[PDB]
C-alpha cells in the first residue's frame, strides 16, 4: 500500500570505507528505497549536480554514497524515497557537509619504559590523523565506589605523559576520547578500559 515517509535519516562519514553511510526509519510496513542527493551550497538552497542514486539493498534500511560521488568540504541535500505501486513517500532532506559527520577512540597505552604515578602515551585513531583533535582522559581507582576524575583539553597524541597522585588503590582504569578541535563533530566513544597499576 502507499509507503509512509521514511524518518530519522542520519548520515555518517566512514573513513574506513571512505563513504557517506546513511540510514532511515522505513516506517509502518506496507517497495524500494533510494537515497537521493544533489551537490549544493550551504542551507542546501543551491540546486547543484545530481549525485548518482544509491538504492538501498533488499532488507537493508540504509545505503552508502562512495566518496568518488561526493564533493568534500561542501554541503549537500540528502533524502530517502520509498516507492510502492500505490505511491511514493519521501523523507525531509538533510543538509550536511560530509566532513562534518565518525571518530573511533584514540590509542591510549602505558609509556613503554614515583609512587602513585602512571606514565602514559597515546596516538590518535590513524584514519583521522589529519584531523586536529582535542581529547579527554578519565581515570579512577578500581574501587567499589565508582567515581571518575577527568583531564580536559589534551592533544590527540602524547609522546609521554605522567599522570600522578594515584594512590587510592593498586590499580586504576583509564579511558580516553577525542573530538574534532574547533569545528563540528561528535565525540569518539571512550577507549577500552585500561587497568594500570600506579607505581606502588
Amino acid at each position: 500500500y502507499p509507503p509512509a515517509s521514511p524518518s530519522n535519516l542520519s548520515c555518517l562519514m566512514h573513513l574506513t570505507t571512505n563513504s557517506l553511510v546513511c540510514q532511515w526509519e522505513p516506517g509502518p510496513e506496507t517497495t524500494s528505497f533510494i537515497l537521493k542527493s544533489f551537490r549544493s551550497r550551504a542551507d542546501c538552497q543551491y540546486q547543484g549536480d545530481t549525485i548518482p542514486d544509491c538504492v538501498a539493498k533488499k532488507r537493508q534500511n540504509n545505503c552508502s554514497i562512495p566518496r568518488k560521488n561526493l564533493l568534500l568540504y561542501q554541503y549537500m541535500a540528502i533524502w530517502v524515497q520509498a516507492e510502492n505501486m500505490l505511491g511514493s513517500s519521501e523523507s525531509p532532506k538533510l543538509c550536511l557537509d560530509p566532513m562534518d559527520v565518525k571518530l573511533e577512540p584514540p590509542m591510549l597505552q602505558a609509556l613503554d619504559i614515583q609512587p602513585g604515578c602512571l606514565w602514559l602515551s597515546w596516538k590518535p585513531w590513524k584514519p583521522s590523523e589529519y584531523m586536529e583533535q582535542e581529547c579527554e582522559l578519565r581515570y579512577q581507582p578500581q574501587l567499589k565506589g565508582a567515581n571518575w576524575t577527568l583531564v580536559f583539553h589534551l592533544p590527540s597524541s602524547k609522546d609521554q605523559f605522567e599522570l600522578c597522585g594515584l594512590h587510592q588503590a593498586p590499580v586504576y582504569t583509564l579511558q580516553m576520547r577525542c573530538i574534532r578541535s574547533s569545528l563540528p563533530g561528535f565525540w569518539s566513544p571512550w577507549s577500552p578500559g585500561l587497568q594500570l597499576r600506579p607505581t606502588m
Binding site: 568540504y73 566532513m99 589529519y130 586536529e132 574547533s182
Partner: peptide, 16 residues
C-alpha cells in the same frame, strides 16, 4: 575563521 580551520584540515588530509 572556520574557513581557515577547514583549509588547514584539507592541507593535512592531502599531506596524508
Amino acid at each position: 575563521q572556520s574557513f581557515l580551520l577547514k583549509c588547514l584540515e584539507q592541507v593535512r588530509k592531502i599531506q596524508g
